[model samples]
Target: PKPGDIFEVELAKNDNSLGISVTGGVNTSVRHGGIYVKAVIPQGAAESDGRIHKGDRVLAVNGVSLEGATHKQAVETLRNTGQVVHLLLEKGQSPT
Candidate 1:
């Protein structure tokens, strides 16, 4: 998908935890340029559900685009989403 594209990916959880983390910007060595999946806990909600994956670009959170969102803004959106978190993701390219 294009950089501006969006995908409806739902993360399922037994409770309220979504079991995922993100990273972005130049602050860290692992610069994703934009918000992307930094980690997916093994056997956790995200991992178990298989909808989200590490390196996938986060386009939006619950229909709210994070295209130009600051790290804090992105965090705030994710935190605000209770129980089920709706994500728009762009799957990373395959290493061929």
Candidate 2:
């Protein structure tokens, strides 16, 4: 999902900077149902929308505000954000 002039990605993990990845709209779980996979790019959403690629872990969504949302619910939250969801992510994980 994407909106206006911004896209969203999730931080899988972070030490000081940000790591990113293309969410591929996959439903996932993290932080015991506090985090999920979610990302948004432009309508012509390029793989280069951000440095984010594959294998990166989404650490947080919209600044890590899970707010007690469920795993599936979290995924939907990104989708429900109406095309643009802010995300915090870590990029550097090895892709499977």
Candidate 3:
């Protein structure tokens, strides 16, 4: 996913406390440069303030390059997606 890319997702806004819920995720495979995990919106934060539902692909962070970010790095970054951070998305995948 990229800054200009957009995929259908269930986006929403909620109260300050635990704002939203991520019932699903859109982006599942966008590993770049290696078998790495791009940045991810912290379950709690994304669920709360980011308004990023459970099933949304985190294409990018503020347009930053998450091409080879580690799991920790990705989660931390996503935990802090500002009010209007940019995102690139992909259709979520199905479970086994």
* Top lDDT prediction, candidate number: 1
TM-score per prediction, in order, is 0.63, 0.37, 0.45
Task: Write the residue-wise lDDT of candidate 3 on 1-96 in tens digits.
Answer: 443345533333232222322222223445531122223345444634464444444545556555665555555564455554444544444242
Alpha carbon deviation, residue 29, candidate 2 (Å): 11
Write the residue-wise lDDT of candidate 1 on 13-85 in tens digits.
5535566676664333242335766676655566566666676776667877666677777766765676677
Assess candidate 1 and give its TM-score to the true structure.
0.63
Q: Rank the candidates by lDDT, best first.
A: 1, 3, 2
Q: Is 1 or 3 the stronger prediction by TM-score?
A: 1
Candidate 1, which segments miss by more than 4 Å at Cα? 1-6, 26-33, 94-96
Q: How many Å off is the CA of 13 in candidate 3?
A: 8.7
lDDT of 2 by residue, 24-55 (tens): 33334433224323443423333334555443
Model 3, position 92: C-alpha lDDT score: 43
Task: Evaluate model 2: give its TM-score.
Answer: 0.37
Question: What is the lDDT, from 0 to 100, of the residue 67 in candidate 3?
Answer: 65
| Candidate 3 wrongly placed segments (more than 4 Å) | 1-5, 8-51
